[PDB]
């Protein structure tokens, strides 16, 4: 809350958006720990722990916490680091859990 809200874009996409899948390098991951400087640690669904930058259009536009499903784009020149591109608000995450693009051993439910 606050007087900040009226300065915003007022982009009201409350209705159910169509979830975006993974495309040739964009992959799903889970936030493991929150770091500083606007950077996060994402355990990808491949047995690797990538370091994902909180990225443009996402920095102060959506607020993300520990244990959040996420979509992240890799970089072919440097595999260790990557960029968080989209965030799924815990509803379509269930849908992906049933469809199982990610290993179901990562069970994160409220």
């Amino acid at each position: 809350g606050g007087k900040k809200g009226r300065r915003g874009k007022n982009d009201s996409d409350g209705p159910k958006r169509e979830l975006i899948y993974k495309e040739e390098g964009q992959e799903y991951a889970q936030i493991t720990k929150m770091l500083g400087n606007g950077r996060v640690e994402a355990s990808c669904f491949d047995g690797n722990k990538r370091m994902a930058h909180i990225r443009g259009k996402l920095r102060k536009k959506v607020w993300m916490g520990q244990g959040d499903i996420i979509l992240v784009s890799l970089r072919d020149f440097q595999d260790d680091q990557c960029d968080v591109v989209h965030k799924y608000n815990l509803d379509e995450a269930r849908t992906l859990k049933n469809q199982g693009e990610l290993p179901e051993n990562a069970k994160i439910n409220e």
Binding site: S12, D13, G14, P15, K16
Partner: protein, 74 residues
Amino acid sequence: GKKRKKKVYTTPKKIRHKHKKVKLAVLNYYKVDDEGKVAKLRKECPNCGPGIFLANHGDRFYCGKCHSTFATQK
């Protein structure tokens, strides 16, 4: 805001009813009696007047001009 998706249809298609065109259609309606008198193969409709030909499909004759009000069993 509005979040609309591409519409998906649970129906194959409905096709425009193309009119059945008939080449040399008019002559089939008549019959020349050897360079002179002529007759009409189809039947004339009384309500419209002379000339308009009744339609025969099965055990009845049907009109085109006052089509709705005339369909008389053969």
